[PDB]
Amino acid sequence: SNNTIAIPTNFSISITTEVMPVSMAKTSVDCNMYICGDSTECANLLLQYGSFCRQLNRALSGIAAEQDRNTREVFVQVKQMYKTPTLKDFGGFNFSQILPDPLKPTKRSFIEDLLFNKVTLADAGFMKQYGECLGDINARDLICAQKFNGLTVLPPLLTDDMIAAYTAALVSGTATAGWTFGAGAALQIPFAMQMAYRFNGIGVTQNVLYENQKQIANQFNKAISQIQESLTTTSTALGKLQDVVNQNAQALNTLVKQLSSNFGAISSVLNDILSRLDKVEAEVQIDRLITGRLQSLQTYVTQQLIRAAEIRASANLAATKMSECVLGQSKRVDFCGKGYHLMSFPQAAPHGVVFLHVTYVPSQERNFTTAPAICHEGKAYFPREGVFVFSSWFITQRNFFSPQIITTDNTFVSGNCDVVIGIINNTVY
Amino acid sequence: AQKFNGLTVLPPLLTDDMIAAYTAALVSGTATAGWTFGAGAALQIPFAMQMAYRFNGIGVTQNVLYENQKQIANQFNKAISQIQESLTTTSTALGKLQDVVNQNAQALNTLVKQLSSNFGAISSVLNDILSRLDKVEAEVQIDRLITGRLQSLQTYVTQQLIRAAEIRASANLAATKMSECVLGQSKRVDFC
Amino acid sequence: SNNTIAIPTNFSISITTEVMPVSMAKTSVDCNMYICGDSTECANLLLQYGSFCRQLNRALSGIAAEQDRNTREVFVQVKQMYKTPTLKDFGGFNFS
Amino acid sequence: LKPTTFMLKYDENGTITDAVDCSQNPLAELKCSVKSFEIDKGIYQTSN
Amino acid sequence: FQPFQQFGRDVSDFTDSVRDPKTSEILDISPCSFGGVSVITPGTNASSEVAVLYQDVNCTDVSTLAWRIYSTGNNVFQTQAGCLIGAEHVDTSYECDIPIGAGICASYHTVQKSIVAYTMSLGADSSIAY
Ligand SMILES: *[C@@H]1O[C@H](CO)[C@@H](O[C@@H]2O[C@H](CO)[C@@H](O)[C@H](O)[C@H]2NC(C)=O)[C@H](O)[C@H]1NC(C)=O
Ligand SMILES: *[C@@H]1O[C@H](CO)[C@@H](O[C@@H]2O[C@H](CO)[C@@H](O)[C@H](O)[C@H]2NC(C)=O)[C@H](O)[C@H]1NC(C)=O
Ligand SMILES: *[C@@H]1O[C@H](CO)[C@@H](O[C@@H]2O[C@H](CO)[C@@H](O)[C@H](O)[C@H]2NC(C)=O)[C@H](O)[C@H]1NC(C)=O
Ligand SMILES: *[C@@H]1O[C@H](CO)[C@@H](O[C@@H]2O[C@H](CO)[C@@H](O)[C@H](O)[C@H]2NC(C)=O)[C@H](O)[C@H]1NC(C)=O
Ligand SMILES: *[C@@H]1O[C@H](CO)[C@@H](O[C@@H]2O[C@H](CO)[C@@H](O)[C@H](O)[C@H]2NC(C)=O)[C@H](O)[C@H]1NC(C)=O
Ligand SMILES: *[C@@H]1O[C@H](CO)[C@@H](O[C@@H]2O[C@H](CO)[C@@H](O)[C@H](O)[C@H]2NC(C)=O)[C@H](O)[C@H]1NC(C)=O
Ligand SMILES: *[C@@H]1O[C@H](CO)[C@@H](O[C@@H]2O[C@H](CO)[C@@H](O)[C@H](O)[C@H]2NC(C)=O)[C@H](O)[C@H]1NC(C)=O
Ligand SMILES: *[C@@H]1O[C@H](CO)[C@@H](O)[C@H](O)[C@H]1NC(C)=O
Ligand SMILES: *[C@@H]1O[C@H](CO)[C@@H](O)[C@H](O)[C@H]1NC(C)=O
């Protein structure tokens, strides 16, 4: 059109989820174990390749350190471990489900428990004893095979309890002080005033928030409940974290399986070679096997490096999102969810983080007749990011219909009524 | 030659017609509703008022836009015309896309060419080996060839992975630019 | 200086271009074809290397899926297929 | 009998209880090419 | 084993079981070396003493002080990251100097100086009144 406008008259509170990988498994390789097993002849022959193995382990250890670096950069963004408030009301906004419950044994929140239940891991102890492996042979444990072939998985520096403590501190800090903390010293403020400020940050007056507080709180609680129900229902919401786990496990298992290749030797079994052949020919066969197995290890390390680069990019994005959506209110379109960003809450998850974005969504648009400017006593009056609307003529904000009587307070005088195209004649109080 | 040596190129899911339809939809949506669509339900508005809002967004009153509308429109049209003429003239403005194409083609053709290496065998021709030698020694020679060709394929795949990571970074940046420059007005200096 | 300022009195509208790659070619490989051609002896000898070829093809298929993912993420950012308006004037701004 | 590639399954005991004949049809070819008796929904590249 | 089978093999083609040729009993064969080991050092420039961390060894009940460790000593004790030998446990919490894993960190402190291990601190404590 050219003479009419559409203005929302209502709004809804929307909460959506964003899942981001942060870290992957840290691994280490015993070259001698993987290549030669317990064979002293093979171990002696392998000595002339020490440089390659040192290079491989240098790369792997770099990756391992980078994983802990990623986790720290994402989650350690607060200097004070703010205590979880005892009363979780905050003017009708029910926070219980996202904060830990003192009654329950777990140190996590309910939604965090759901998230940790939705991802399945091969093992969580990082401890497998020789007696355990030798005594459950009938099970044919993949971890036992990996370990017996010299492949180790190291535990992360920060525990799940510590990560959950950091997330609880972040949620409590935002709920009690808002955004002032993270730019200096935390300054506490009531949650209603905080929400009023956030509303003001998206071009809506805070009278709206204060006059619709009960409705807004009810909508927030309902959105939280919907998230909880959806997470309870089985789905593939954490597919990214799941396939990170799966990729690591598959890489290690493939490495184990590749030991069965001959690589052109008479056999793939060192014991068979050494039982049948004397030293001279055994050396040729063993050299072929060493070459092949070293190549396999190098391929594993290369693919690990590429995966680690991808994970690091994801972790950097996650840290930026923490800073710009959790510790402040963002104006970047579609960065902190869809809609006009209000505020975000983080939650820990296996190998990653989950952001809950809370945004403002206009709805129920109505028609009005609009004019670029109004002529009064031969003088042209313009708006200042408002719009003129004909119910009489009024001035209103573009995100919520609140018609107001025109006056010199809310109008900008400029020129006469000749240049302006489409100007209508009116009076100004 | 590529196909006869077992290398295939697959078609993309979305066709050029569908991509062009999406771009046309985006342009029409911005021209008819501005920035409201993308944050919720599209809200139509006249283009002059939309431009006045955009002017207001950079610290300039909208009386300026309304009082210089004809000059602003003429300058916009002239800029469009200059872009069109520059694109018509032959140049290297699309060098990035051209070199993406060139890199993919070169990788495949190098893969085809590398089949002529002996890798230490008496010949690089399986038919020659099998016509001259009995099974026992033919096996040794063929094992050498298999090792070499497998290594060639692995090198190709590794370089493809690295190129793909670079392309993915560029695509993420492009998506961010779509969201922040096309669907809204940005304040980040030199971003849009 | 310390007591004077410079203020613009006019302006110009500038339009510039930015070119960005989004996707590259999706490819697949037939190990047996590439390595052995039509030779049954070589095909039989190649069987003990199936793991490496499965690994290669897994990587390539991942890349192939990622390309379509990139294109969708860049271009599918609207829920309604807004129709092209018949009149392309828009108050003097020529969109044709 | 004919020369062919089979994929045999050994169970918890040492007994072969199932097999896949890789040359029977395209689905069998895909099963042998991914080395698994089960396939998820989707589209997969097979041999030329 | 069936009567015509003498050896068994795993997915890696390693020979993992065999029938005894005299009694016909079936035996499993397992490797001897197993388990992860780490070395903690304050720097050779400072000292030649080290601490050793055995992942996959449980030392909670130190009553034999058949453990799979190279050597025992003073201050052998269990931590969330495994069996630690050669470090003294202290109850105070400091900033992580040498991260061992699973929330444990080691340092080189004046008792004479020795290697100490502790639980890392997560940050200073605060009380904000909502
Ligand atoms: C905006 O929409 C909300 C939600 O639909 C409206 O809230 C309704 O309020 C009435 C009482 O006035 C309740 O009986 C309804 O159940 C509410 N609707 C719900 C919960 O969906 C609200 O009235 C609308 N208008 C404004 C100005 O907010
Ligand atoms: C915040 O929400 C929680 C969860 O919905 C409420 O706790 C539930 O309260 C009902 C009613 O007393 C009980 O039947 C449920 O068993 C409670 N669930 C849990 C998980 O504790 C809680 O009451 C709400 N808070 C407020 C102030 O309304
Ligand atoms: C800003 O510069 C433009 C372009 O030079 C001026 O617009 C010109 O105005 C004159 C009359 O004053 C016309 O004859 C020309 O056709 C206009 N355009 C050009 C390209 O020459 C404009 O007057 C200057 N000042 C302002 C305030 O806009
Ligand atoms: C918008 O620009 C286009 C392209 O310059 C104009 O279309 C041209 O109009 C001229 C004059 O009538 C014709 O000779 C050309 O053949 C047209 N070109 C094409 C590609 O259609 C169009 O008229 C302009 N629109 C307005 C409203 O001025
Ligand atoms: C492996 O063989 C054993 C021994 O025959 C099987 O175990 C018996 O199975 C039968 C049939 O189900 C049961 O009636 C017996 O009670 C089982 N014996 C024991 C000691 O559990 C076993 O089922 C076989 N495994 C498979 C996968 O078929
Ligand atoms: C091989 O000879 C040995 C030694 O005689 C046999 O082992 C003994 O067999 C007897 C008769 O069953 C048992 O009572 C003994 O306990 C076995 N051990 C020893 C150390 O005497 C063995 O059975 C013979 N093997 C075969 C396959 O005939
Ligand atoms: C190391 O072994 C000891 C001795 O068995 C374990 O200590 C017991 O663990 C059980 C199972 O959690 C507890 O119920 C007992 O209370 C523990 N006893 C004591 C005296 O602490 C210990 O858990 C084992 N360590 C690991 C890491 O598995
Ligand atoms: C506003 O008026 C237009 C006139 O075409 C109509 O199509 C549209 O539905 C109206 N909007 C509402 C919310 O009724
Ligand atoms: C190196 O040696 C001294 C003497 O052992 C040690 O105490 C000191 O810390 C080291 N020097 C440094 C760290 O500059």
Short mmCIF file of N, CA, C and O in Angstrom, two decimals, chain B residues 82-170:
data_model
loop_
_atom_site.label_atom_id
_atom_site.label_comp_id
_atom_site.label_asym_id
_atom_site.label_seq_id
_atom_site.Cartn_x
_atom_site.Cartn_y
_atom_site.Cartn_z
N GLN B 82 24.95 1.87 -12.43
CA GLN B 82 26.40 1.71 -12.43
C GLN B 82 26.79 0.27 -12.11
O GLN B 82 27.69 -0.29 -12.74
N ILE B 83 26.11 -0.34 -11.14
CA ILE B 83 26.37 -1.75 -10.84
C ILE B 83 26.11 -2.60 -12.08
O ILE B 83 26.89 -3.49 -12.43
N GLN B 84 24.98 -2.35 -12.75
CA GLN B 84 24.63 -3.14 -13.92
C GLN B 84 25.68 -3.01 -15.01
O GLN B 84 26.10 -4.01 -15.61
N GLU B 85 26.13 -1.78 -15.28
CA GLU B 85 27.14 -1.58 -16.32
C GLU B 85 28.45 -2.26 -15.95
O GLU B 85 29.08 -2.92 -16.79
N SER B 86 28.88 -2.12 -14.69
CA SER B 86 30.12 -2.75 -14.27
C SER B 86 30.04 -4.27 -14.42
O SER B 86 31.00 -4.91 -14.87
N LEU B 87 28.91 -4.86 -14.04
CA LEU B 87 28.75 -6.30 -14.20
C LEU B 87 28.75 -6.69 -15.67
O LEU B 87 29.32 -7.73 -16.04
N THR B 88 28.13 -5.88 -16.52
CA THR B 88 28.12 -6.18 -17.95
C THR B 88 29.54 -6.19 -18.51
O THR B 88 29.91 -7.08 -19.28
N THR B 89 30.35 -5.21 -18.13
CA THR B 89 31.74 -5.19 -18.57
C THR B 89 32.49 -6.39 -18.01
O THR B 89 32.34 -6.74 -16.83
N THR B 90 33.30 -7.01 -18.85
CA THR B 90 34.08 -8.17 -18.42
C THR B 90 35.09 -7.75 -17.35
O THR B 90 35.77 -6.73 -17.48
N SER B 91 35.19 -8.56 -16.30
CA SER B 91 36.10 -8.29 -15.20
C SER B 91 36.28 -9.58 -14.40
O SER B 91 35.87 -10.66 -14.84
N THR B 92 36.90 -9.47 -13.23
CA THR B 92 37.12 -10.61 -12.35
C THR B 92 36.43 -10.39 -11.01
O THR B 92 37.02 -10.62 -9.95
N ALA B 93 35.18 -9.93 -11.04
CA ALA B 93 34.46 -9.65 -9.80
C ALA B 93 34.02 -10.93 -9.10
O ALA B 93 33.85 -10.93 -7.88
N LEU B 94 33.83 -12.02 -9.84
CA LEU B 94 33.38 -13.30 -9.28
C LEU B 94 34.53 -14.30 -9.21
O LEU B 94 34.35 -15.51 -9.37
N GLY B 95 35.74 -13.79 -8.94
CA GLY B 95 36.91 -14.65 -8.89
C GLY B 95 36.81 -15.73 -7.82
O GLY B 95 37.31 -16.84 -8.02
N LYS B 96 36.19 -15.42 -6.69
CA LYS B 96 36.08 -16.40 -5.61
C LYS B 96 35.27 -17.61 -6.06
O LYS B 96 35.68 -18.76 -5.87
N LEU B 97 34.10 -17.37 -6.65
CA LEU B 97 33.28 -18.48 -7.12
C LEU B 97 34.00 -19.24 -8.24
O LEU B 97 34.01 -20.48 -8.26
N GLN B 98 34.63 -18.50 -9.15
CA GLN B 98 35.34 -19.15 -10.25
C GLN B 98 36.44 -20.06 -9.72
O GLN B 98 36.62 -21.17 -10.22
N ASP B 99 37.19 -19.61 -8.71
CA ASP B 99 38.29 -20.42 -8.21
C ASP B 99 37.81 -21.59 -7.35
O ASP B 99 38.50 -22.61 -7.30
N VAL B 100 36.65 -21.47 -6.71
CA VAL B 100 36.05 -22.66 -6.10
C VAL B 100 35.82 -23.73 -7.16
O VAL B 100 36.22 -24.90 -7.00
N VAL B 101 35.18 -23.34 -8.26
CA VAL B 101 34.94 -24.29 -9.35
C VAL B 101 36.25 -24.88 -9.84
O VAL B 101 36.39 -26.11 -10.01
N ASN B 102 37.24 -24.01 -10.07
CA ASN B 102 38.52 -24.46 -10.62
C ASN B 102 39.22 -25.44 -9.69
O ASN B 102 39.80 -26.43 -10.14
N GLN B 103 39.18 -25.17 -8.38
CA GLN B 103 39.84 -26.05 -7.42
C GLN B 103 39.21 -27.44 -7.43
O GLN B 103 39.92 -28.45 -7.43
N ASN B 104 37.87 -27.50 -7.44
CA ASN B 104 37.24 -28.82 -7.48
C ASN B 104 37.64 -29.59 -8.73
O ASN B 104 38.04 -30.77 -8.67
N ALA B 105 37.55 -28.93 -9.89
CA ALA B 105 37.88 -29.61 -11.14
C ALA B 105 39.33 -30.08 -11.14
O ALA B 105 39.63 -31.21 -11.56
N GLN B 106 40.25 -29.23 -10.68
CA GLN B 106 41.66 -29.58 -10.68
C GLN B 106 41.92 -30.77 -9.76
O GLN B 106 42.73 -31.64 -10.09
N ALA B 107 41.27 -30.81 -8.60
CA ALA B 107 41.46 -31.94 -7.70
C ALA B 107 41.06 -33.24 -8.38
O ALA B 107 41.82 -34.23 -8.35
N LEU B 108 39.89 -33.26 -9.01
CA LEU B 108 39.47 -34.50 -9.67
C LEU B 108 40.42 -34.89 -10.80
O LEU B 108 40.77 -36.07 -10.96
N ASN B 109 40.85 -33.91 -11.60
CA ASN B 109 41.71 -34.23 -12.74
C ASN B 109 43.08 -34.72 -12.28
O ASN B 109 43.67 -35.62 -12.90
N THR B 110 43.61 -34.14 -11.20
CA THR B 110 44.86 -34.65 -10.63
C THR B 110 44.69 -36.09 -10.16
O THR B 110 45.58 -36.92 -10.36
N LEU B 111 43.55 -36.39 -9.53
CA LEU B 111 43.28 -37.76 -9.13
C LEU B 111 43.33 -38.70 -10.33
O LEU B 111 43.89 -39.79 -10.25
N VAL B 112 42.75 -38.28 -11.46
CA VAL B 112 42.78 -39.11 -12.66
C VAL B 112 44.22 -39.30 -13.14
O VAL B 112 44.64 -40.41 -13.48
N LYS B 113 44.99 -38.21 -13.17
CA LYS B 113 46.35 -38.28 -13.72
C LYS B 113 47.26 -39.16 -12.87
O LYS B 113 48.14 -39.84 -13.42
N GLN B 114 47.09 -39.15 -11.55
CA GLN B 114 48.02 -39.88 -10.69
C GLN B 114 47.96 -41.39 -10.86
O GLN B 114 48.75 -42.09 -10.23
N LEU B 115 47.06 -41.92 -11.70
CA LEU B 115 47.00 -43.35 -11.93
C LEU B 115 48.20 -43.88 -12.72
O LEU B 115 48.37 -45.10 -12.79
N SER B 116 49.02 -43.01 -13.29
CA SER B 116 50.11 -43.44 -14.15
C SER B 116 51.41 -43.71 -13.40
O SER B 116 52.41 -44.06 -14.04
N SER B 117 51.43 -43.57 -12.08
CA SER B 117 52.64 -43.81 -11.31
C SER B 117 52.83 -45.30 -11.04
O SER B 117 51.87 -46.04 -10.83
N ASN B 118 54.10 -45.73 -11.05
CA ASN B 118 54.42 -47.13 -10.79
C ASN B 118 54.34 -47.48 -9.31
O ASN B 118 53.99 -48.62 -8.97
N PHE B 119 54.68 -46.55 -8.43
CA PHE B 119 54.77 -46.81 -6.99
C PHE B 119 55.77 -47.92 -6.69
O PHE B 119 55.64 -48.63 -5.69
N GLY B 120 56.78 -48.07 -7.54
CA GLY B 120 57.80 -49.08 -7.36
C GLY B 120 57.53 -50.41 -8.02
O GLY B 120 58.37 -51.31 -7.94
N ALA B 121 56.37 -50.58 -8.67
CA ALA B 121 56.09 -51.81 -9.39
C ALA B 121 56.76 -51.79 -10.76
O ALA B 121 57.24 -50.76 -11.23
N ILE B 122 56.81 -52.96 -11.40
CA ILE B 122 57.43 -53.06 -12.71
C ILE B 122 56.65 -52.28 -13.76
O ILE B 122 57.21 -51.92 -14.80
N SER B 123 55.37 -52.03 -13.53
CA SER B 123 54.55 -51.26 -14.46
C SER B 123 53.35 -50.72 -13.71
O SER B 123 53.00 -51.19 -12.63
N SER B 124 52.71 -49.71 -14.31
CA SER B 124 51.49 -49.14 -13.77
C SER B 124 50.24 -49.68 -14.45
O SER B 124 49.15 -49.17 -14.21
N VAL B 125 50.38 -50.71 -15.28
CA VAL B 125 49.27 -51.28 -16.03
C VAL B 125 48.99 -52.68 -15.49
O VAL B 125 49.80 -53.60 -15.64
N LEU B 126 47.81 -52.83 -14.87
CA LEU B 126 47.43 -54.12 -14.32
C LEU B 126 47.35 -55.18 -15.41
O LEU B 126 47.74 -56.34 -15.18
N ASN B 127 46.85 -54.82 -16.58
CA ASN B 127 46.75 -55.78 -17.67
C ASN B 127 48.13 -56.27 -18.09
O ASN B 127 48.32 -57.46 -18.34
N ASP B 128 49.11 -55.36 -18.17
CA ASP B 128 50.47 -55.77 -18.51
C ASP B 128 51.03 -56.71 -17.45
O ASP B 128 51.61 -57.76 -17.77
N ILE B 129 50.86 -56.35 -16.18
CA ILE B 129 51.38 -57.20 -15.10
C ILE B 129 50.77 -58.59 -15.20
O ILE B 129 51.48 -59.60 -15.12
N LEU B 130 49.45 -58.67 -15.37
CA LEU B 130 48.77 -59.96 -15.36
C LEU B 130 49.01 -60.75 -16.64
O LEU B 130 48.91 -61.98 -16.62
N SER B 131 49.33 -60.08 -17.75
CA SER B 131 49.69 -60.79 -18.97
C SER B 131 51.10 -61.35 -18.91
O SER B 131 51.38 -62.37 -19.55
N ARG B 132 52.00 -60.70 -18.17
CA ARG B 132 53.39 -61.17 -18.15
C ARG B 132 53.68 -62.14 -17.01
O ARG B 132 54.47 -63.07 -17.19
N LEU B 133 53.08 -61.94 -15.84
CA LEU B 133 53.51 -62.62 -14.62
C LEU B 133 52.46 -63.60 -14.13
O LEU B 133 51.26 -63.40 -14.32
N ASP B 134 52.93 -64.66 -13.49
CA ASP B 134 52.05 -65.61 -12.83
C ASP B 134 51.60 -65.06 -11.47
O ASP B 134 52.11 -64.05 -10.97
N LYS B 135 50.64 -65.76 -10.87
CA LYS B 135 49.89 -65.21 -9.74
C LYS B 135 50.82 -64.76 -8.61
O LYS B 135 50.59 -63.72 -8.00
N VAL B 136 51.87 -65.53 -8.34
CA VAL B 136 52.66 -65.29 -7.12
C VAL B 136 53.31 -63.91 -7.16
O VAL B 136 53.20 -63.13 -6.21
N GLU B 137 54.01 -63.60 -8.25
CA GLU B 137 54.67 -62.30 -8.36
C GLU B 137 53.70 -61.19 -8.76
O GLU B 137 53.87 -60.03 -8.35
N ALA B 138 52.69 -61.54 -9.56
CA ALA B 138 51.64 -60.58 -9.86
C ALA B 138 51.03 -60.03 -8.58
O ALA B 138 50.69 -58.85 -8.50
N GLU B 139 50.91 -60.88 -7.55
CA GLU B 139 50.33 -60.43 -6.29
C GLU B 139 51.19 -59.35 -5.64
O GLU B 139 50.66 -58.35 -5.14
N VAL B 140 52.51 -59.52 -5.64
CA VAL B 140 53.39 -58.52 -5.06
C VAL B 140 53.24 -57.19 -5.79
O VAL B 140 53.06 -56.13 -5.17
N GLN B 141 53.31 -57.24 -7.12
CA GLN B 141 53.22 -56.00 -7.89
C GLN B 141 51.87 -55.31 -7.66
O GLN B 141 51.80 -54.09 -7.45
N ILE B 142 50.79 -56.09 -7.68
CA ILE B 142 49.46 -55.52 -7.49
C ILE B 142 49.30 -54.95 -6.09
O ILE B 142 48.60 -53.95 -5.90
N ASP B 143 49.92 -55.58 -5.09
CA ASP B 143 49.87 -55.03 -3.74
C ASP B 143 50.52 -53.65 -3.69
O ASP B 143 49.98 -52.72 -3.07
N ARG B 144 51.67 -53.50 -4.35
CA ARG B 144 52.30 -52.18 -4.41
C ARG B 144 51.35 -51.16 -5.03
O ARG B 144 51.17 -50.04 -4.51
N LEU B 145 50.73 -51.52 -6.16
CA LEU B 145 49.83 -50.59 -6.83
C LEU B 145 48.65 -50.22 -5.93
O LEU B 145 48.24 -49.05 -5.87
N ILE B 146 48.08 -51.20 -5.23
CA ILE B 146 46.94 -50.95 -4.36
C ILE B 146 47.32 -49.96 -3.27
O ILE B 146 46.58 -49.01 -2.97
N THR B 147 48.48 -50.17 -2.65
CA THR B 147 48.93 -49.25 -1.60
C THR B 147 49.02 -47.83 -2.14
O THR B 147 48.49 -46.88 -1.53
N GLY B 148 49.68 -47.66 -3.29
CA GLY B 148 49.84 -46.31 -3.83
C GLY B 148 48.52 -45.63 -4.13
O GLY B 148 48.30 -44.47 -3.77
N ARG B 149 47.61 -46.35 -4.79
CA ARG B 149 46.36 -45.73 -5.20
C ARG B 149 45.47 -45.41 -4.00
O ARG B 149 44.80 -44.37 -3.97
N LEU B 150 45.48 -46.28 -2.99
CA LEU B 150 44.76 -45.97 -1.76
C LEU B 150 45.30 -44.69 -1.13
O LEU B 150 44.52 -43.84 -0.67
N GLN B 151 46.63 -44.53 -1.10
CA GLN B 151 47.20 -43.30 -0.56
C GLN B 151 46.73 -42.08 -1.35
O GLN B 151 46.44 -41.03 -0.76
N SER B 152 46.68 -42.19 -2.68
CA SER B 152 46.20 -41.07 -3.49
C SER B 152 44.78 -40.67 -3.07
O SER B 152 44.49 -39.48 -2.87
N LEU B 153 43.90 -41.66 -2.94
CA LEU B 153 42.52 -41.36 -2.54
C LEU B 153 42.48 -40.69 -1.17
O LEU B 153 41.71 -39.74 -0.96
N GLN B 154 43.28 -41.19 -0.22
CA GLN B 154 43.28 -40.59 1.12
C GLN B 154 43.71 -39.13 1.07
O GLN B 154 43.12 -38.28 1.76
N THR B 155 44.73 -38.82 0.28
CA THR B 155 45.16 -37.43 0.15
C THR B 155 44.04 -36.56 -0.39
O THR B 155 43.77 -35.45 0.12
N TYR B 156 43.36 -37.04 -1.44
CA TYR B 156 42.23 -36.29 -1.99
C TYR B 156 41.19 -36.00 -0.91
O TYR B 156 40.71 -34.87 -0.78
N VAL B 157 40.84 -37.02 -0.11
CA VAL B 157 39.79 -36.84 0.89
C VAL B 157 40.21 -35.84 1.96
O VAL B 157 39.41 -35.01 2.40
N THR B 158 41.47 -35.91 2.41
CA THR B 158 41.93 -34.97 3.43
C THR B 158 41.83 -33.53 2.93
O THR B 158 41.32 -32.64 3.64
N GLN B 159 42.30 -33.28 1.71
CA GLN B 159 42.22 -31.92 1.19
C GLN B 159 40.78 -31.47 1.00
O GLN B 159 40.45 -30.30 1.22
N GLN B 160 39.89 -32.40 0.61
CA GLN B 160 38.48 -32.06 0.51
C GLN B 160 37.92 -31.64 1.86
O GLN B 160 37.14 -30.69 1.95
N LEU B 161 38.30 -32.35 2.93
CA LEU B 161 37.80 -31.98 4.26
C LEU B 161 38.23 -30.57 4.64
O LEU B 161 37.43 -29.78 5.16
N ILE B 162 39.50 -30.23 4.38
CA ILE B 162 39.98 -28.90 4.75
C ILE B 162 39.24 -27.82 3.95
O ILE B 162 38.78 -26.80 4.50
N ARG B 163 39.09 -28.04 2.64
CA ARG B 163 38.35 -27.09 1.81
C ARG B 163 36.92 -26.93 2.31
O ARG B 163 36.38 -25.81 2.34
N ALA B 164 36.29 -28.04 2.69
CA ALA B 164 34.91 -27.98 3.17
C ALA B 164 34.81 -27.16 4.44
O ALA B 164 33.84 -26.41 4.62
N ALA B 165 35.78 -27.29 5.35
CA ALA B 165 35.75 -26.48 6.56
C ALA B 165 35.82 -24.99 6.22
O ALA B 165 35.07 -24.17 6.78
N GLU B 166 36.70 -24.62 5.29
CA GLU B 166 36.78 -23.22 4.89
C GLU B 166 35.45 -22.74 4.31
O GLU B 166 34.95 -21.65 4.66
N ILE B 167 34.85 -23.55 3.43
CA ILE B 167 33.58 -23.17 2.81
C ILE B 167 32.50 -23.01 3.87
O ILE B 167 31.65 -22.12 3.78
N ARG B 168 32.50 -23.88 4.88
CA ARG B 168 31.49 -23.80 5.93
C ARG B 168 31.63 -22.52 6.73
O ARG B 168 30.63 -21.89 7.10
N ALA B 169 32.86 -22.11 7.03
CA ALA B 169 33.05 -20.83 7.71
C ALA B 169 32.47 -19.69 6.87
O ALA B 169 31.75 -18.82 7.39
N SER B 170 32.76 -19.70 5.57
CA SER B 170 32.24 -18.63 4.71
C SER B 170 30.71 -18.64 4.68
O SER B 170 30.07 -17.58 4.70
#
